[PDB]
C-alpha cells in the first residue's frame, strides 16, 4: 500500500481536524527494568534451564502496519497510533499512480 | 394402553409442615378445621402458609408492617403475618397496631405494646375472627435473600447482573478477563 | 462442513424476480411504519445495506423502533427447542406491511360498527366467524333433461 506522509484527521487534544505528519511506528527497545523482564531474569537465573515457552512456530508472514500521526500544530504535538490492515509491501509517501499512461516497454 | 404421560401426575406441594413443632402442629389442626368447615379463603391461605418452609416465610420488619397498615382504609384492621415480626430500628414512631404473628421479636414486641398495640397468636386470631374478617394478610419480602443475587442468568453472559460465587472480594478476584475490554473482552 | 457465510444458500433467495431488476420503486420508501405494526421481512438483494439474515426471510415481526432508514423488528426465531424473540435492524427496502393485521383491524371496525347498529336498532347478529357448515338440503332440477351417461374409455397406447 501507499499512504501519504501527511493527512488531515481528528486530533483529540485540539478536539478538531488538524494536519498530521505520518510516519511508520517501530517497536522500541526493551527496558530490562520492566517488571516482566525483571521477573523473567530472576526466574531464569540459577539452574532449571528455560523456564518460559519459546514460540518458534511462526505462521504469519506480514504485520499490521502502524502509522504514528503527529499533530503539526506547534503547541499540540499530540501523537496517535492508527493500525491499517496487513500488507506485504508498505510505502510511505511514494509516487502516486496515473491512469492514461504507457507501461514501460 | 392409554396415550397419556405420567410425569406430572404427582403435584409437588406441602400437604403438612415438615416441622415437628407440636405447637405449630396444634394450630395447623385448628386451621385445617377452619379451612375445611368455613368458606373463607383467608383460612386456606393461612393454612397453606403454616405448611411452608422458613425461606418461604420471610420475616416482616416493623417498618414494612407499619407502611402497609398505613394505607387508606386499613385502620382498625388486624395485620396477620405467618412468620416472625422483626423490629426495625430505622423507624422512630410506632403507631397503635393490632397484629397476629407466629413469632414476634422481643424488642419488636416491647415497641408494639408501648405504642398501645395488641399482639395475638394464631389461636387468638381464630377466636377473634374465625373467617378472617377485617384483616390485612401481609408477607415479608420473599426474594430478600442473598441466594437470589446469585440466581438468574450466568454471570459470564451479556446483560446479566447476577452475583458470582467468590471466596473473597477484591481487585484480584474475578475482575480481569471477561470483565473489562482491556483484558480480552467484557460482555 | 457447511460454511458459516452470512449469505450461503441465498442464491435465489436474494435474487430479483425475472424482469424486475433495476431501480427500486419509490413507494417502498414512502411507506409509513410506526411502533407496533406487523411487517413481513422480505430481503431484496438490490440493496446490500440493512439486509436481514437469511433466517428472517419470510418471517413476520412487530416494529418497536424507527430510525432514518431502518426499523427495529421483534421477530420470533426458533432455535432447537426454544423460540426466542430476536430484535433486528432492517432497512425499509426489506420489509412491507403485513395484510393479515390489516384484515383483522378491518374486521374489528366492522364488528364494532355492527354492534353499534344492532344495539341502536334492536337486533342481535352473529359476529364470530364460523367454520364452513355442512351443506343445506336443496332440490336439483333436471329441467326435463336426463343426466348424461358416463362410461370409462377404452385403453389405447397414446404415443
Amino acid at each position: 500500500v501507499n499512504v501519504p506522509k501527511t493527512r488531515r484527521t481528528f486530533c483529540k487534544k485540539c478536539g478538531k481536524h488538524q494536519p498530521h505528519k505520518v510516519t511508520q511506528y517501530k517497536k522500541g527497545k526493551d527496558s530490562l527494568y520492566a517488571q516482566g523482564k525483571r521477573r523473567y531474569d530472576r526466574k531464569q537465573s540459577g539452574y532449571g534451564g528455560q523456564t518460559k515457552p519459546i514460540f518458534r512456530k511462526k505462521a504469519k508472514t506480514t504485520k499490521k502496519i502502524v502509522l504514528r500521526l503527529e499533530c503539526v500544530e506547534p503547541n499540540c504535538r499530540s501523537k496517535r497510533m492508527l493500525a491499517i490492515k496487513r500488507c506485504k509491501h508498505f510505502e510511505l509517501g511514494g509516487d502516486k499512480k496515473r491512469k492514461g499512461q504507457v507501461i514501460q516497454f | 394402553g392409554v396415550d397419556i404421560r405420567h410425569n406430572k401426575d404427582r403435584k409437588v406441594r406441602r400437604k403438612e409442615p415438615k416441622s415437628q413443632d407440636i405447637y405449630l402442629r396444634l394450630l395447623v389442626k385448628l386451621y385445617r378445621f377452619l379451612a375445611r368447615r368455613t368458606n373463607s379463603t383467608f383460612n386456606q391461605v393461612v393454612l397453606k402458609r403454616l405448611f411452608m418452609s422458613r425461606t418461604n416465610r420471610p420475616p416482616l420488619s416493623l417498618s414494612r408492617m407499619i407502611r402497609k397498615m398505613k394505607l387508606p382504609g386499613r385502620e382498625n384492621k388486624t395485620a396477620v403475618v405467618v412468620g416472625t415480626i422483626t423490629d426495625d430500628v430505622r423507624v422512630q414512631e410506632v403507631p397503635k397496631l393490632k397484629v397476629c404473628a407466629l413469632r414476634v421479636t422481643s424488642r419488636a414486641r416491647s415497641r408494639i405494646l408501648r405504642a398501645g398495640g395488641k399482639i395475638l397468636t394464631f389461636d387468638q386470631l381464630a377466636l377473634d375472627s374465625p373467617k378472617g374478617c377485617g384483616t390485612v394478610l401481609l408477607s415479608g419480602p420473599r426474594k430478600g435473600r442473598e441466594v437470589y443475587r446469585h440466581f438468574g442468568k450466568a454471570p459470564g453472559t451479556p446483560h446479566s447482573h447476577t452475583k458470582p460465587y467468590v471466596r473473597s472480594k477484591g481487585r484480584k478476584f474475578e475482575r480481569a478477563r471477561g470483565r473489562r475490554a482491556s483484558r480480552g473482552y467484557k460482555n | 462442513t457447511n460454511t458459516k457465510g452470512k449469505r450461503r444458500g441465498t442464491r435465489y433467495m436474494f435474487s430479483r424476480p425475472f424482469r424486475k431488476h433495476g431501480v427500486v420503486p419509490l413507494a417502498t420508501y414512502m411507506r409509513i411504519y410506526k411502533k407496533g405494526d406487523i411487517v413481513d421481512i422480505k430481503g431484496m438483494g438490490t440493496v446490500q445495506k440493512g439486509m436481514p439474515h437469511k433466517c428472517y426471510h419470510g418471517k413476520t415481526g412487530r416494529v418497536y423502533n424507527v430510525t432514518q432508514h431502518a426499523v427495529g423488528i421483534v421477530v420470533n426465531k426458533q432455535v432447537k427447542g426454544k423460540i426466542l424473540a430476536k430484535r433486528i435492524n432492517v432497512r425499509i427496502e426489506h420489509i412491507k406491511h403485513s395484510k393479515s393485521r390489516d384484515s383483522f383491524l378491518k374486521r374489528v371496525k366492522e364488528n364494532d360498527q355492527k354492534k353499534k347498529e344492532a344495539k341502536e336498532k334492536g337486533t342481535w347478529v352473529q359476529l364470530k366467524r364460523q367454520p364452513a357448515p355442512p351443506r343445506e338440503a336443496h332440490f336439483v332440477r333436471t329441467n326435463g333433461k336426463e343426466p348424461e351417461l358416463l362410461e370409462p374409455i377404452p385403453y389405447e397406447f397414446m404415443a
Binding site: - | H150, A154, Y165, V166, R167 | -
Partner: protein, 53 residues
Amino acid sequence: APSRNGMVLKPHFHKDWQRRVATWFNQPARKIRRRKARQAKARRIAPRPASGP
C-alpha cells in the same frame, strides 16, 4: 471437574497434612492443669495479688 455454578475452591491439602494434625482431646485436661497451677501459685504468694504485678 467443575459442575455448574460454584466457587473456585483452593484447598491446601496437597502437602501430606495427615501426618501433622493437632487434635484437642487434651484441651479439658490442659484447662485443669493450668487452673491447678494458677491455684498453686496463688497459695505460694500468700497475701500478694494472685494475678501478678
